[PDB]
Design a protein around this nucleic acid. Structure first.
Ligand code: MG
Ligand code: MG
Ligand code: MG
Ligand code: MG
Ligand code: MG
Ligand code: MG
Ligand code: MG
Ligand code: MG
Ligand code: MG
Ligand code: MG
Ligand code: MG
Ligand code: MG
Ligand code: MG
Ligand code: MG
Ligand code: MG
Ligand code: MG
Lengths: 49, 49, 106
RNA sequence: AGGCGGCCGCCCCCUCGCCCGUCACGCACCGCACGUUCGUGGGGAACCUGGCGCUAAACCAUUCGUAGACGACCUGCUUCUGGGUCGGGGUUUCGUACGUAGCAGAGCAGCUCCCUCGCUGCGAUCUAUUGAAAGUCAGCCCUCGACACAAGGGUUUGUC
RNA sequence: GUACCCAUAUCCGCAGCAGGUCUCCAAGGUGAACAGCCUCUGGCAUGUUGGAACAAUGUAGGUAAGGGAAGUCGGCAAGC
């Protein structure tokens, strides 16, 4: 990760971003759920219990 | 790996402004760099030595 | 220099991935010989007709996914090979595959 | 693109370390060339002696995939936070497994205590068991659960 | 005269050559069918080589969002 050897503004650098939502769905295939607790609360009980 | 970010865009004068934009975003794991060596360079008329 | 005997569950479905239809069952037995040579250590591997039936029971391309095997090691006599020990791989059937692991059989 | 030079205090000593004058000799090899030099010249293989020390690394084999036509490249190997094979979970893909029971089921046939949905038999499907069963890294993740393995081999490589 | 081959190995083609050569017998299922596919009686080792990997290019086969011949001398090929 190399620092940029030229400094430019261009209304492209130094903008205060606002992060809202970062998905962590199942990338091994098609993701259907966000978190493990949300997946368990949606699906309910299974044969594991 | 790679993820999304639902990001608010504070860039005026566009259709993008005041709206949520989802972008392709990578993740790079960066462990802290442990320092070992010091290398000095002399400026030669063929380059650096 | 032992006479030991151990059971295994070789997974041919994850030891074969990307082998053609007319070679998927013959490459499985080379994989079983390589697995026996890696586990027991002797190059001499003899598999049985029962294991031949258990592999070739479903054609060349529909290889059964997992096979319970039993590897016994024995000595050899009567003008033997330079490899004095040989692994006699025999087949033992089992209905299910879950919660089955390696068992040292007396 | 550096290694010789300068200062201080001593050391085994030298006052002929140089020019001017006297003395006597050293090969005077009797006419002959390549002679006198920065040379204790450059590097290579060995011989005997003094002191100070040094006690390895590549390549093959094997494994690995972030790489591959073959070579080549990035990797693991300890007996304790080492690696490998199964197993267990997590994720996912398809879509509800065999068996069992039904007062679900187009209906049909048979029996008699003559039967107030009577029973039995055949019967595509359906329901509950069932988001079930099945595969899941071989190029997905975690596992200190069970087994065995581990310094086990071959080739080559030195600077007055 | 009476053996044997009568053939993707006993014939011809320089050869154990995807070439050519005249005949009788012909089962079960699906199926109109001696069509195509799977079996039985009967034969065979994949057709003068095996092992490892699945790179380019190739030879055969199948797909592909939206447009549908706009490519090309021509709907050539492929597909309905
Ligand atoms: Mg089924
Ligand atoms: Mg005859
Ligand atoms: Mg011919
Ligand atoms: Mg012919
Ligand atoms: Mg010819
Ligand atoms: Mg017929
Ligand atoms: Mg018919
Ligand atoms: Mg052959
Ligand atoms: Mg032939
Ligand atoms: Mg298309
Ligand atoms: Mg389309
Ligand atoms: Mg049209
Ligand atoms: Mg037109
Ligand atoms: Mg034209
Ligand atoms: Mg045409
Ligand atoms: Mg089509």
């Amino acid at each position: 990760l190399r620092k940029s050897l030229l400094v430019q503004t261009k209304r492209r650098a130094l903008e205060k971003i606002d992060l809202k939502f970062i998905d962590t769905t199942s990338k091994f295939g098609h993701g259907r759920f966000q978190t493990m607790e949300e997946k368990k609360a949606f699906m309910g009980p299974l044969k594991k219990d | 790996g790679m993820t999304h970010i639902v990001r608010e865009v504070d860039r005026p004068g566009s259709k993008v402004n005041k709206k949520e934009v989802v972008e392709a975003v990578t993740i790079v794991e960066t462990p802290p760099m442990v320092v070992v060596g010091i290398v000095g360079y002399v400026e030669t008329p063929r380059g650096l030595r | 220099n032992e006479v030991v005997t151990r059971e295994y569950t070789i997974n041919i479905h994850k030891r074969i991935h990307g082998v053609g239809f007319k070679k998927r069952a013959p490459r499985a037995l080379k994989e079983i010989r390589k697995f026996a040579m890696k586990e027991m250590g002797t190059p001499d591997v003899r598999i049985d007709t029962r294991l031949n039936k258990a592999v070739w029971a479903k054609g060349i391309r529909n290889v059964p996914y997992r096979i319970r095997v039993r590897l016994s090691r024995k000595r050899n006599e009567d003008e033997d090979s330079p490899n004095k020990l040989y692994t006699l791989v025999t087949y033992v059937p089992v209905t299910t595959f879950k919660n089955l692991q390696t068992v040292n059989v007396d």
